[PDB]
Curated annotation (Swiss-Prot), chain A:
One of its GO terms (molecular function) is structural constituent of ribosome. Belongs to the universal ribosomal protein uL23 family. One of the early assembly proteins it binds 23S rRNA. One of the proteins that surrounds the polypeptide exit tunnel on the outside of the ribosome. Forms the main docking site for trigger factor binding to the ribosome. This is Large ribosomal subunit protein uL23. One of its GO terms (biological process) is translation. Part of the 50S ribosomal subunit. Contacts protein L29, and trigger factor when it is bound to the ribosome. Keywords: Ribonucleoprotein, Ribosomal protein, RNA-binding, rRNA-binding. The keyword Zinc-finger does not apply.
From Swiss-Prot, chain B:
This is Large ribosomal subunit protein bL34. The keyword Ribonucleoprotein applies. Keywords: Ribonucleoprotein, Ribosomal protein. HAMAP family: Ribosomal_bL34. Residues 1-44 are annotated as: Disordered. The lineage of its organism: Bacteria, Bacillati, Bacillota, Bacilli, Bacillales. InterPro entries: Ribosomal_bL34 (IPR000271), Ribosomal_bL34_CS (IPR020939). It comes from Staphylococcus aureus (strain USA300). GO terms for molecular function: structural constituent of ribosome.
From Swiss-Prot, chain D:
It comes from Staphylococcus aureus (strain USA300). One of two assembly initiator proteins, it binds directly to the 5'-end of the 23S rRNA, where it nucleates assembly of the 50S subunit. Part of the 50S ribosomal subunit. The keyword Nucleus does not apply. Pfam families: KOW, ribosomal_L24. InterPro entries: KOW, Rib_uL2_dom2, Ribosomal_uL24, Ribosomal_uL24_CS, Ribosomal_uL24_KOW, Translation_prot_SH3-like_sf. This is Large ribosomal subunit protein uL24. One of its GO terms (cellular component) is ribosome. GO terms for molecular function: rRNA binding; structural constituent of ribosome. It comes from the Bacteria. The keyword Transmembrane helix does not apply. Belongs to the universal ribosomal protein uL24 family.
From Swiss-Prot, chain E:
This is Large ribosomal subunit protein bL28. One of its GO terms (molecular function) is structural constituent of ribosome. The keyword Membrane does not apply. Keywords: Ribonucleoprotein, Ribosomal protein. One of its GO terms (cellular component) is ribosome. It comes from the Bacteria. Disulfide bonds: none annotated. Belongs to the bacterial ribosomal protein bL28 family. The lineage of its organism: Bacteria, Bacillati, Bacillota, Bacilli, Bacillales. The gene is rpmB. The keyword Ribosomal protein applies. It comes from Staphylococcus aureus (strain USA300).
Amino acid sequence: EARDILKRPVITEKSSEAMAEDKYTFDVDTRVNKTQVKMAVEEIFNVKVASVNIMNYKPKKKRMGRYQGYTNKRRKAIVTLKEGSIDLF
Amino acid sequence: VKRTYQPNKRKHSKVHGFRKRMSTKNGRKVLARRRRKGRKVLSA
Amino acid sequence: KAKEIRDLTTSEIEEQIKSSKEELFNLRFQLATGQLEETARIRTVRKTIARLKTVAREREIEQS
Amino acid sequence: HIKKGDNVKVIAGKDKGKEGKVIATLPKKDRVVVEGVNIMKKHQKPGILETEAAIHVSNVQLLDPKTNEPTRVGYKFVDGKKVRIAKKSGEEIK
Amino acid sequence: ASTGNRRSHALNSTKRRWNANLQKVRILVDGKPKKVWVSARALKSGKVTRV
RNA sequence: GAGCUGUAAGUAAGCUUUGAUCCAGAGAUUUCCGAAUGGGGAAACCCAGCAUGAGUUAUGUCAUGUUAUCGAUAUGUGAAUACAUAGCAUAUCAGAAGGCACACCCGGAGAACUGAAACAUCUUAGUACCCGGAGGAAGAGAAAGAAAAUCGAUUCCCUUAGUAGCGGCGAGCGAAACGGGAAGAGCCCAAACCAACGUUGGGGUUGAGGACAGGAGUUACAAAGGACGACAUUAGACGAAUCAUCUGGAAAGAUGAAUCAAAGAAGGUAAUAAUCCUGUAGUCGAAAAUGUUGUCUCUCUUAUCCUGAGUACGACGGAGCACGUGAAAUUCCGUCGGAAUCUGGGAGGACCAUCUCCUAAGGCUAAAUACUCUCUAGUGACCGAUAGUGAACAGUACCGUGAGGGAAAGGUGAAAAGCACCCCGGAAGGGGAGUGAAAUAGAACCUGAAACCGUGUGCU
RNA sequence: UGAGUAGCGAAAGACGGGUGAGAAUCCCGUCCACCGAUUGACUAAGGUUUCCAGAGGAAGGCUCGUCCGCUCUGGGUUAGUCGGGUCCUAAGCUGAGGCCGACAGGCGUAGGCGAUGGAUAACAGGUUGAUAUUCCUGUACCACCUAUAUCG
RNA sequence: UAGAAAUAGGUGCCCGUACCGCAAACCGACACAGGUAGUCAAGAUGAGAAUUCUAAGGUGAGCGAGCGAACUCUCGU
Ligand SMILES: [K+]
Ligand SMILES: [K+]
Ligand SMILES: [Mg+2]
Ligand SMILES: [Mg+2]
Ligand SMILES: [Mg+2]
Ligand SMILES: [Mg+2]
Ligand SMILES: [Mg+2]
Ligand SMILES: [Mg+2]
Ligand SMILES: [Mg+2]
Ligand SMILES: [Mg+2]
Ligand SMILES: [Mg+2]
Ligand SMILES: [Mg+2]
Ligand SMILES: [Mg+2]
Ligand SMILES: [Mg+2]
Ligand SMILES: [Mg+2]
Ligand SMILES: [Mg+2]
Ligand SMILES: [Mg+2]
Ligand SMILES: [Mg+2]
Ligand SMILES: [Mg+2]
Ligand SMILES: [Mg+2]
Ligand SMILES: [Mg+2]
Ligand SMILES: [Mg+2]
Ligand SMILES: [Mg+2]
Ligand SMILES: [Mg+2]
Ligand SMILES: [Mg+2]
Ligand SMILES: [Mg+2]
Ligand SMILES: [Mg+2]
Ligand SMILES: [Mg+2]
Ligand SMILES: [Mg+2]
Ligand SMILES: [Mg+2]
Ligand SMILES: [Mg+2]
Ligand SMILES: [Mg+2]
Ligand SMILES: [Mg+2]
Ligand SMILES: [Mg+2]
Ligand SMILES: [Mg+2]
Ligand SMILES: [Mg+2]
Ligand SMILES: [Mg+2]
Ligand SMILES: [Mg+2]
Ligand SMILES: [Mg+2]
Ligand SMILES: [Mg+2]
Ligand SMILES: [Mg+2]
Ligand SMILES: [Mg+2]
Ligand SMILES: [Mg+2]
Ligand SMILES: [Mg+2]
Ligand SMILES: [Mg+2]
Ligand SMILES: [Mg+2]
Ligand SMILES: [Mg+2]
Ligand SMILES: [Mg+2]
Ligand SMILES: [Mg+2]
Ligand SMILES: [Mg+2]
C-alpha cells in the first residue's frame, strides 16, 4: 500500500528550496496519516526519515467557460530525511 | 443597523442540516419532497 | 493477456501484481517530473493489474 | 460496403463521373475521402493547402469487375465467410 | 375506541369518541402474571381470567 | 468485421484482421454517506473494543474480520424470597427497520372556502390534507341472498332512471331488483363420533347435512421436486430494381428511355429518389440467461347425538346504508343487559299470523375490473422555440434562515473549405486579397418586420 | 421621452522623475495634510482563495487606468506542547428498558451528547514573494516504549 | 481501604493554520456615511481613556478643472 500512499512528487520553487534542505514534498492520499507517509517513504526509497509535516488543501474554485467547478482536494506531506537521498529525476 | 441574518455555521447545521431533517417524520418528508423535485441540494 | 496470466501459479500472479504496481508507480513519478512522454504505458499497466486481480479472484472463487 | 483501397465512381456532386481510390472511411459520419475528389483549398497559417474533403458515401459507387459499370454490391457465403459480390454480374469483388 | 358525533338539539355535529370501559387488572398474560388494561365487557365474556 | 482511446475539437502516446472500438447474455470489482446498525456526529466525518495478522527491541501506526436495538432459538446463571419467577451473561438465526410513481387499492382520521342568492339542519364531502398496510392488482365472493314465476357465489359494463325514494320536502341528494352482456369455480374447517398417549391423528362440512346404523394437483381446493420438447424475449443476418441529357455549386427536379414491386412505410444523400444510402415486404438467426408453456415424471386420493354464545338480539348514544329517526326494516361501533338448540333459528321495509325463501355468529378462492413512474413497438385534421414540459440549450442560474419559489437561452455553410498574405491600428475594429453558389452566410453567423437612431436632399 | 439633464456616496493635496499607444487618477521621490482610547496592533465570529508572483485591460471599478479585492497562468497554509478531538461536566438535547397516546407520536430512568466554564507539556531568535510558539537554530518540557540497577 | 530509580535510546495521530476581519473580502442587493464580541493603551495638558496637539503606526477617501450669480445647505460676524 506504500505505493498507494504516495501519489506524486511536488516540484515547485518552494519545494526545490526545501529539497536543498533535504526536505521532499509529495502529494499523498487524502486519507493517510503522517506515520503512514513516513513508512511509505522508508519502504519505497530505502532512506531514514527524520520527520513528516503534513497539510490539507481545500478544493480550488475553477472554470472552463460557463462550467465552473472545483479542483480535487489535496494532502501535502513534507518529508525531512535523516539519511539517504531521493533521486526523483 | 443590525439586519435579520447573522450567519452561524453551527446554528445553520443544527436547525437545517441533514441529520436534523432525518430526526423527524416531517423533516424526512422535506427530504423526500426535495428528492422528488430533483434538487441538487437537499439540506445544509 | 488474460490467456498468459491464466498459465501462472497463484503466487506468481501475486509476484507480477507487485512488480506491475511498482512499474506503475515509477511511471507516475516520471510523469509528474515531466520525464515520461510515453503516456500510453500508464493505461497498459493499469489494465494488466486489473486482469491479474481478476484471475486471482476467479481462482480464489473456484477453490472455495 | 465501400472499403479503403476500393476503386469507386463518383455518381453525384461536382466530380460526378470521376473514378478514384477510397483513401479514408469515416463510418460514424457515413463519409469517405476519395483521391482527386472534392479538393478543398485551406488557408494554412504557419499557405494554401489543397487536399481532399470527405463526401457522402452515397455519392460513390463500386465498379463491376466484368463490365466496369457501376454496381450495387450484395453478400454471399462461401465456407463461412461473407464476400462482396456485384449485382450486375455476380463476380466476387476484390 | 370508535369515532362518531355528538349531536345537539339543533343537530349541530361535533366529533367525539366512544372509549372502552378499560380496567387495570392482572390477567396472567403468556403464563406470566401482568397488570394490563382490559375492558369490563371482556372480563364479563370470560376469555380473560384475572389473577 | 475496420477502425478505435465518451461527449469532443487538439495534439501526444498508443490499441487493432494474432479480430480492437462497439452490441447482447452471464460473471468479477464495486471507496464513503445514507434505514446506517461498534460509539459519537453539524450526512458523506471523528473516536473505539475484541480476535487474527503485518511491521517495530518495543510503543506509536497499519490490514482483515467482528461488535446497534427489538425479535427468534438454546445453554447457563441468579434477586426481593424458601421453591420459583423477574432479571442477567453467552452462543446460534438473520425475522423487522428504510424507500417508493407508493398513480391504482384497503383501512384509521378528517376540514374549509363554497351552494342554499343571508345562515345554523343540509351542501362542499367522506372531497383536500395527514397516518397505517399491501398487491400486481386490491377489495368482494359461494346465499340465515334476490324474489313472489322462479333464480342460483362475487365483480364489472349497458339499462332500469334522474325513476322509486330522501330532503329547512329548500338548495340539493339519489338507488336497487328484473332484463341484456364481459368473465365464470368452487372449496377447507369447528362439532358429534372413532384410534392412541387434554393432545395428536382419522372422520365431516349442510337446507336439511353429518355422526351413528383410473382422477385430481402446487391459480383456492395438500405439498416439494426432476427429464425432454416448444415458443417467446434479451445481440443480429440476408434482402428487388436506372441510366442519359438540361438548368444548376450540387439533381433526387425537367426531359427521354428503362426496371423492381409480398418491397410506392420512412429517413438521409449538395434542390423534391420505389430502383444512391440506411431501410421497407419477406425470410433467416442464439453460446448464455430469463420467462410462459406441453408431455413424461412426481405427489395425494379411490332426528338418538352434532351443526360456530357473552353470540344473535334488546335499551341508550352514534355511525353506515340514496334515505336527515322517520311508517325505518337491513349493517356496524361504545355502554349495559342478554336467547333458542331441527317441534331450532333468520329474512321477505314497523309489527303480528300464515306462506315463501334461506341456514348467521370460522376461513380460502382465479377471471372478467382500476392505474402507468416504467419498458418495447407504434399512432395523431396534437405544439413547432412568448408555442410544446418549468426545462429542445434546468429543478440549473438566481431569490429565501428555512419550508419553498424559480427563469432566460434553438438555426454559419452542402462541406470548415472558419478568411494564407498585404495595409491602418497597442488592441479592438476595419479595407483589400482569398474560400464559398452566396461573406449584408465571418461565428452577436438562415430570414431580419416595427418602434427607435442617423446620413443625403426634391418641395416647403 | 425626460436629457447630455440629476447624480458620480462625509475629507488635502502639490510638484519632480518614471512607465506607456494613451497618465489629475499607476510606480518612485520630496514637501504638505488627516487619525492617533485610534483611520494603529492583535484575537473571535462570518466569508471562503479574495493571499503571492508574472502577464493583461474586453466587461467590472460611479471618471481615467499602464492599476486592482477584476481577467489569464503558475504558486502559497508545515504543530507531541497554539485552538479543538483521542479529558470533564452546565443549560439544553437525546434516551436501553419504561409510562402515556386514534395513527403519526409525547414524555421519561440508567446512560449519552453538549462550552460560553473546569483540566491540560515551549520558549527566545532568525528566515520567505506568499507560513510560522508550526520551518531553521538554541535551549526545554510532557506522555508512552525499551534497555542497563509495591500497586490499589 | 477492600482488592491485586537514574541514565541512555526510541515513539508521539486527526482537524484548523492562506487572506479580510470594527471592513472594499462579514451582516446591510453596492468597492453602501449604518451594525459587528474581546485584547493592547505612548508623550504634552489635565481629575480623566475629557480636551487640543503629537508618537508608534496608518491614511489623503476611485471623477476632475474653472467661476466666485440667484437660491438651498453648513459656518462666522
Ligand atoms: K446520394
Ligand atoms: K498560519
Ligand atoms: Mg497540521
Ligand atoms: Mg453507510
Ligand atoms: Mg456507522
Ligand atoms: Mg450514528
Ligand atoms: Mg436477525
Ligand atoms: Mg437481522
Ligand atoms: Mg410501496
Ligand atoms: Mg404502500
Ligand atoms: Mg351561502
Ligand atoms: Mg398512508
Ligand atoms: Mg402505505
Ligand atoms: Mg441489408
Ligand atoms: Mg437496395
Ligand atoms: Mg440523375
Ligand atoms: Mg353454520
Ligand atoms: Mg345512519
Ligand atoms: Mg341501515
Ligand atoms: Mg331504514
Ligand atoms: Mg334482525
Ligand atoms: Mg423564431
Ligand atoms: Mg419554453
Ligand atoms: Mg473578413
Ligand atoms: Mg480586414
Ligand atoms: Mg479583408
Ligand atoms: Mg470575409
Ligand atoms: Mg442579404
Ligand atoms: Mg441574420
Ligand atoms: Mg432621454
Ligand atoms: Mg450641459
Ligand atoms: Mg430640465
Ligand atoms: Mg441644471
Ligand atoms: Mg452637477
Ligand atoms: Mg467619492
Ligand atoms: Mg491632528
Ligand atoms: Mg493581490
Ligand atoms: Mg471605466
Ligand atoms: Mg486575481
Ligand atoms: Mg426523552
Ligand atoms: Mg400506548
Ligand atoms: Mg471553551
Ligand atoms: Mg502573512
Ligand atoms: Mg495568518
Ligand atoms: Mg479588502
Ligand atoms: Mg470609495
Ligand atoms: Mg463600509
Ligand atoms: Mg459599519
Ligand atoms: Mg488612565
Ligand atoms: Mg479624544
